[PDB]
Design an enzyme around this catalytic site. Structure first.
Site, PDB file in Angstrom:
ATOM      1  N   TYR A 111      41.364 -50.248  -9.978  1.00 27.50           N
ATOM      2  CA  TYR A 111      40.422 -51.509  -9.887  1.00 27.50           C
ATOM      3  C   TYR A 111      38.621 -51.126 -10.852  1.00 27.50           C
ATOM      4  CZ  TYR A 111      37.832 -55.652  -9.991  1.00 27.50           C
ATOM      5  OH  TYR A 111      36.395 -56.688  -9.701  1.00 27.50           O
ATOM      6  N   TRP A 113      34.891 -52.257 -13.577  1.00 30.43           N
ATOM      7  CA  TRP A 113      33.965 -53.069 -14.386  1.00 30.43           C
ATOM      8  C   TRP A 113      34.479 -52.613 -15.706  1.00 30.43           C
ATOM      9  CZ3 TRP A 113      31.726 -57.223 -16.500  1.00 30.43           C
ATOM     10  CH2 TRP A 113      31.608 -58.049 -15.271  1.00 30.43           C
TER      11      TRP A 113
END
Ligand SMILES: NC1=NC(=O)C2=N[C@H]3C(S)=C(S)[C@@H](COP(=O)(O)OP(=O)(O)OC[C@H]4O[C@@H](n5cnc6c(=O)[nH]c(N)nc65)[C@H](O)[C@@H]4O)O[C@H]3NC2=N1
Ligand SMILES: NC1=NC(=O)C2=N[C@H]3C(S)=C(S)[C@@H](COP(=O)(O)OP(=O)(O)OC[C@H]4O[C@@H](n5cnc6c(=O)[nH]c(N)nc65)[C@H](O)[C@@H]4O)O[C@H]3NC2=N1
Length: 778
Positions: A111, A113
């Site tokens: 996971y 950004w």
């Protein structure tokens, strides 16, 4: 190299000045209506002292492999190795784990950004390589809307959180009362998942210019409050649902709510009403009952309910209130309240869950979609994974429960499965050693991994804890293509290479093509294309769709030379969310079983989850400010950083602008400071039963009494990784969070369900070691 080059990032489009091969300045696009001051740190992150120069192997793992002492991960004892040695080793480890344990032994959720870019999508690239290697365990959902994205489909029949909002200009012409509930759009609109257009700033400015009434419901006097001079409601954190129930109760008791809207567009209100009235539990959910829990005056609660019922009102909610225990209830109760107001689908009315994120509400253009490299998943049959080998997917925030309990059962949104037995985790473009909850538990749980591989370009806590660290390049060291505007689709940008790869850094693409090549699947990973072959293939597909849509675009070279293509807005500024459902619900039903808004959900009733009842319900969380028997006195507003994108840019020049005595700042109310003998600027210890961290206090009444603000994203800097419960020298707020599920429905994280104590720090002095590279990587 002396010139200028335009590119983009999660902070917006910009032009770089290059002087003798070094980027010296990032200047915002001339069409960006409200650039972010964080661009200075973006540029600085290419060169800062924590830039990762070389591929490194953790000495213990280099020497002992699976027999390493795993308790010393994070001490910084690394050995510099060549790219060939590191790639051989990573390829050998992937092969070994896949062969020995199956795909179930490899966690590839990774996971994070990362950076925008259709080609250099490090997490998708990782998964493309892992698919070729035999498969991997993936993650589901995200940390942003873990709960809301799962409860919305049951309630409104759609994802809702990541869908276009009623357009900003429609709000300026129709909305009389705009409510920012647990939302700070001034703060969070600085960035985009794809390149941001900052479309919220002109939207907010237009509301202010129209003189529209604005009400902010937030424990902190944010810049959203300041910008508008908004009427500011300060609920004790975690009590919004009680407040909503008090408003709903008032609307019934005063006979004001929209009975027709409830009868015609909703299902199950008749099973919710008795509970609201207290018939099922002897506890009428009055404004007074909500004042008891939340601290907001009962009369204010009723006055707000009456105001919202009598004016065209838009309830623009943010996501911190669902990133908490029982998080699902927050947006379910908000939609329920909004159904009682009866304005869903009217211009300027209803609710919106993305006005504070990536430009939600900026008018969409008629341009085409842009897609980039894929993981190869819909391309050769992944073998058979049987339930006995565990699930192939877990809710993202269950990663530590998974590691600690292989083969154990877990519930998720109506289905029970078993945790796979993971031995390897491969992370790129993410920082779990900052984003995941309960750092001390997580640090211990990571010992269950034989091998942990990380790629990043900054020496984050995650890179510091890896067995193998491979230096990635930034977007500014390669070429890419990306949409401007997650919702607006303003245009498509050429993310042009600005400088050559620094030091020995390599794109994730190059790294994964190398590993894949060593696994015998090199050709399959590249698909016979190079960087521009891939980029032109994505563009051409976009162009073909545009040509078929009446939005013809130039040829690729012509587009690349200009550096951007922009699209026209046709009817995107008229968009009203829910209008087609409002206008004829039989013709345009929602995607729920009834076709209506489900205030009572028979599907959730059947799951029999004690922590997620079948209608919005006020339940006590694990801990809350002033809760009966709560141990700790202060709520930590562990929210998103103003001057970082999560942990991103912590190791840049920006840090000096907010650090207090070198530590992450902690906002504290003057009364709470004075009671502990704390002075503005003092170094304080923030601690509970899960951990202890150091912060530097900033005394201000911007935080309501009883609440302290410590943003998420601080680079965890343990005093001694071999000491359980070790003090964090810098201030990662996740050392203090608990690692629990919102409920069995979503299993979202509860990173903002945090109570702690604060005292002036009286332990040994501390030296920060997280903002310089490990000695061997210098
Ligand atoms: N307590 C708490 N409260 C919260 O509100 C909260 N928010 C949560 C949410 S919503 C999120 S999304 C998470 C954020 O957690 P996330 O791990 O997404 O945080 P970032 O700091 O964006 O980490 C991204 C990393 O990718 C690296 N990187 C960027 N581009 C590249 C690339 O091209 N290649 C490689 N190899 N690396 C790259 C960056 O340098 C950075 O280290 O925090 C979660 N944690 C939270 N905790
Ligand atoms: N500058 C910036 N940095 C980032 O890291 C960043 N991350 C991006 C991401 S991934 C997303 S998910 C979004 C996050 O958007 P999200 O709305 O989840 O943002 P937060 O900063 O966690 O919380 C917003 C507000 O909620 C308030 N709040 C906290 N607890 C409560 C509560 O119990 N009740 C009420 N009524 N209010 C409460 C906080 O004080 C804060 O001002 O921002 C995105 N944009 C971002 N911008």
């Amino acid at each position: 190299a002396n010139g200028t080059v335009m590119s983009g990032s999660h902070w917006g489009v910009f032009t770089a000045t290059v002087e003798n091969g070094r980027a010296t300045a990032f200047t915002p696009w001339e069409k960006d209506p409200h650039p972010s001051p964080m661009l200075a740190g973006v540029l600085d992150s290419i060169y800062s002292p924590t830039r990762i120069k070389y591929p490194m192997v953790r000495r213990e793992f280099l020497e002992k492999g699976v027999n390493a002492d795993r308790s010393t991960r994070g001490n910084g004892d690394f050995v510099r190795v060549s790219w060939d040695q590191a790639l051989d080793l990573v390829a050998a480890e992937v092969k070994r784990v896949e062969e020995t344990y199956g795909p179930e032994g490899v966690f590839g959720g990774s996971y994070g950004w990362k950076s925008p870019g259709r080609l250099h999508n490090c997490t998708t690239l990782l998964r493309r390589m892992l698919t070729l290697a035999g498969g991997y365990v993936n993650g589901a959902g995200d940390y942003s809307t873990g709960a809301a994205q799962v409860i919305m489909p049951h309630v409104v029949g759609t994802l809702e959180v990541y869908e276009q909002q009623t357009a900003w200009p429609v709000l300026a012409e129709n909305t009389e009362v705009m409510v920012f509930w647990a939302a700070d759009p001034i703060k969070t609109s600085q960035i985009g998942w794809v390149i941001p257009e900052h479309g919220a700033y002109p939207g907010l400015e237009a509301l202010k210019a129209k003189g529209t009434k604005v009400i902010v419901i937030d424990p902190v006097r944010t810049k959203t409050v300041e910008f508008f001079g908004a009427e500011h409601i300060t609920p004790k954190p975690q009590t919004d649902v009680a407040i909503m129930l008090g408003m709903a109760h008032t609307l019934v008791a005063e006979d004001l709510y929209d009975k027709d809207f409830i009868a015609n567009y909703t299902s199950g209100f008749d099973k919710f009403l008795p509970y609201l009235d207290g018939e099922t539990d002897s506890t009428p959910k009055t404004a007074e009952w909500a004042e008891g829990i939340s601290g907001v005056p009962a009369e204010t609660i009723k006055e707000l309910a009456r105001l919202f019922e009598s004016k065209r009102t838009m309830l623009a909610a943010g996501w911190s209130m669902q990133r908490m225990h029982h998080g699902e209830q927050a947006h379910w109760m908000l939609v329920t309240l909004a159904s009682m107001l009866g304005q869903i689908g009217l211009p300027g009315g209803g609710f919106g869950l993305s006005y504070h994120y990536s430009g939600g509400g900026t008018p969409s253009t008629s341009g085409p979609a842009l897609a980039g490299i894929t993981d190869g998943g819909a391309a050769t049959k992944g073998p058979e994974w049987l339930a006995a080998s565990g699930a192939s997917v877990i809710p993202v925030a269950r990663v530590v429960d998974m590691l600690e309990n292989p083969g154990a059962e877990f519930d998720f949104n109506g289905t029970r499965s078993k945790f796979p037995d993971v031995k390897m985790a491969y992370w790129v473009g993410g920082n779990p050693f900052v984003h995941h909850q309960d750092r001390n538990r997580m640090v211990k749980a990571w010992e269950k991994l034989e091998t942990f591989v990380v790629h990043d370009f900054q020496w984050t806590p995650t890179a510091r804890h890896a067995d193998i660290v491979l230096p990635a390049t930034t977007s500014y060291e390669r070429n890419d293509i990306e949409t401007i505007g997650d919702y607006s689709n303003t245009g498509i940008l050429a993310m042009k290479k600005i400088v050559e790869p620094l030091y020995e850094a390599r794109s994730d693409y190059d790294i994964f093509a190398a590993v894949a090549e060593r696994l015998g699947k090199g050709a399959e990973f590249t698909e016979g294309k190079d960087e521009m072959g891939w980029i032109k293939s994505f563009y051409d597909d976009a162009a073909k769709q545009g040509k078929a849509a009446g939005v013809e675009m130039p040829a690729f070279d012509a587009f690349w030379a200009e550096g951007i293509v922009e699209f026209p807005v046709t009817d995107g500024a008229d968009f009203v969310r829910y209008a087609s459902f409002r206008e004829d619900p039989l013709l345009n039903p929602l995607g729920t079983p009834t076709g209506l808004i489900e205030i009572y959900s028979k599907n959730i009733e059947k799951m029999g989850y004690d922590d997620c009842p079948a209608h919005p319900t006020w339940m006590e969380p694990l801990e809350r400010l002033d809760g009966p028997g709560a141990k700790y006195p202060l709520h930590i507003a562990a929210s998103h950083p103003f001057n970082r994108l999560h942990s991103q840019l912590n190791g840049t020049v920006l840090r000096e602008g907010y650090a207090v005595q070198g530590h992450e700042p902690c906002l504290m109310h003057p009364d709470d400071a004075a009671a502990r003998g704390i002075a503005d600027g003092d170094v304080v210890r923030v601690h509970n039963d899960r951990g202890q961290i150091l912060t530097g206090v900033k005394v201000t009444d911007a935080v309501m009494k009883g609440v302290i603000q410590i943003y998420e994203g601080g680079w965890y800097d343990p005093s001694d990784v071999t000491e359980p419960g070790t003090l964090d020298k810098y201030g990662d707020v996740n050392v203090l969070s608990a690692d629990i599920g919102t409920s069995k429905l979503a299993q979202g994280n509860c990173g903002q369900t945090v109570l702690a104590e604060v005292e002036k720090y009286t332990g040994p002095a501390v030296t920060l070691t997280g903002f310089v590279a490990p000695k061997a990587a210098e």
